[PDB]
Fold this protein.
Amino acid sequence: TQAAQDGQSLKTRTMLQADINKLMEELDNIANTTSFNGKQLLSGNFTN
Amino acid sequence: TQAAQDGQSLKTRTMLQADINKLMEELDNIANTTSFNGKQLLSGNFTNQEFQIGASSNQTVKATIGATQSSKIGVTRFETGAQSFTSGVVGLTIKN
């Protein structure tokens, strides 16, 4: 939303995108990291 | 208006025109200078810009500041007919 305005040049939008990249990296890290004793919980292999 | 009087020779009128050139040099200097962070505002490249102001995805206002250089603002239209040698009752009609 902050970058959806037109008071921001391509450089500042690029800063936004670079930050979003790291945030999404963190999201993937949480997903692939949370585990009980090896059993990865939030990855998709905890079914049935 | 100061130059439309006939109490001024061509020399003094030239000082008038010499001045307008500088003033008009200033006008389009303002047009090419006002900017936020490089975005020229009063130049003609601020057309169809959005400003997301809503919770959902496409609520936005739009801004289309026209161009205001010294070559695009004052555009009058002159007309003049041939030397009329004939008489007669005339009625014009400026269409549209």
